[PDB]
A paper describes a structure:
PDFs are ubiquitous essential metalloenzymes which co-translationally remove the formyl group carried by the initiator methionine in bacteria, mitochondria and chloroplast. Here, we present and characterize a PDF enzyme issued from the bacterium Streptococcus agalactiae (SaPDF) which behaves as an excellent structural platform to describe PDF-inhibitor interactions. Like most other PDFs, SaPDF behaves as a monomer and its crystal structure reveals a classical PDF fold. In addition, SaPDF contains the typical insertions of type 2 PDFs12, including an eight-amino acids loop folded as an α-helix (insertion 2) and a long loop connecting strands β2 and β3 usually referred as the CD-loop (insertion 3).
The ligand binding site is localized at the interface between the N and the C sub-domains, as evidenced by the structures of the complexes between SaPDF and synthetic tripeptides. Crystal-soaking experiments were conducted with formylated peptides (Fo-Met-Ala-Ser and Fo-Met-Ala-Arg) but led to deformylated molecules in the crystal structures as previously reported for other PDFs2627. This is due to the ability of the enzyme to deformylate formylated substrates in the crystal packing. Peptides, which therefore represent deformylation reaction products, were found bonded to SaPDF through a high number of non-covalent interactions, which are similar to those found previously with Escherichia coli PDF (EcPDF). Indeed, the free N-terminal amine group coordinated catalytic ion and was hydrogen bonded to the catalytic residue Glu175. The hydrophobic methionine side chain fitted into a deep hydrophobic S1’ pocket composed of several conserved residues (Val71, Leu125, Glu129, Tyr167, Val171, His174). Finally, peptides were in a conformation mimicking a β-strand which was hydrogen-bonded with the main backbone peptide bond of Gly130 from conserved motif II (E129GCLS133), Val71 from conserved motif I (G70VGLAAPQ77), and Gly69 which preceds motif I, linking the two β-sheets from N- and C-terminal sub-domains.
Author numbering: 2 to 204
C-alpha cells in the first residue's frame, strides 16, 4: 500500500508521493489515529516533517524537485489519517542575523482540531497555494483569524494551543485537508478578492 512505500528507511517523500486534485482521498474525512501509535504512523509523521525541512532547504529542494511547503497532511500522500506536519520558519533580520528561534511552529500533530476561534476572520494577502493543485488559483482564502487547537503528539501527550497570524492560517489549512476541505472552498465564488468589512488581511 501507499504507507508501506513511504515508511521505508531510505525513502524520501517527494512530489511523486503527493496526490493531485481529483483524487477521491483528498475529499474524504480522514480517520482518527489510535494510541499507542503504530510504527508506520510514527514513521510517517517523521517522514512528513522531513519533507517540509527538505522543501525549505534550497539545495535539497532542488535535488528532490520540491516546491517549498510549511505544512503537509497525510491525505495528500493518499493516507486517510488525521496526521499533519507544520513547519513555519522565522526570518532573518535586515542585517542577516538568524532569528532567536529557527521556527515559530514545528510540530507533527495527530488528531488535531479547532476547539474554539475568533469571530474575526483573516486571509493571507497573497492567497494560498497547494502542493496537490497544479493550477493558478487567485483569491482570499477566508479563515478564522485566531484559533485554539487541541492535538496529540507522537507520544500520545495532549496539547492545547492558541494560534494567530500566519501560524493560525497554516494549521487551519492542514486541518481542512483531514476533513476533505480544499483552500478554494473558502474563496468567494463571485469575486475572489471580495473583502467583508473587518477581514484581517495578513501581508
Ligand atoms: Ni516517493
Ligand atoms: Ni521514531
Ligand atoms: Ni535530510
Ligand atoms: Ni478540550
Ligand atoms: Ni465556530
Ligand atoms: Ni495543502
Ligand atoms: Ni472553523
Ligand atoms: Ni469556487
Amino acid at each position: 500500500a501507499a504507507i508501506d512505500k513511504l515508511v521505508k528507511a531510505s525513502h524520501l517523500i517527494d512530489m511523486n508521493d503527493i496526490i493531485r486534485e481529483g483524487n477521491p482521498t483528498l475529499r474524504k474525512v480522514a480517520e482518527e489515529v489510535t494510541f499507542p501509535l503504530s510504527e508506520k504512523e510514527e514513521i510517517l509523521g517523521e517522514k512528513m516533517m522531513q519533507f517540509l525541512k527538505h522543501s525549505q532547504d534550497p539545495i535539497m529542494a532542488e535535488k528532490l524537485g520540491l516546491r517549498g511547503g510549511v505544512g503537509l497532511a497525510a491525505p495528500q500522500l493518499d493516507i486517510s489519517k488525521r496526521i499533519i506536519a507544520v513547519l513555519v520558519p522565522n526570518v532573518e533580520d535586515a542585517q542577516g542575523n538568524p532569528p532567536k528561534e529557527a521556527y515559530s511552529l514545528q510540530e507533527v500533530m495527530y488528531n488535531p482540531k479547532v476547539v474554539s476561534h475568533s469571530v474575526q476572520d483573516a486571509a493571507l494577502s497573497d492567497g494560498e497555494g497547494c502542493l496537490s493543485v497544479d493550477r493558478e488559483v487567485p483569491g482570499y482564502v477566508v479563515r478564522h483569524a485566531r484559533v485554539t487547537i487541541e492535538y496529540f503528539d507522537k507520544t500520545g501527550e495532549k496539547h492545547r494551543l492558541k494560534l494567530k497570524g500566519y501560524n493560525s492560517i497554516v494549521v487551519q489549512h492542514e486541518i481542512d485537508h483531514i476533513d476533505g476541505i480544499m483552500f478554494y472552498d473558502r474563496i468567494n465564488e463571485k469575486n475572489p478578492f471580495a473583502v467583508k468589512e473587518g477581514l484581517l488581511i495578513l501581508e
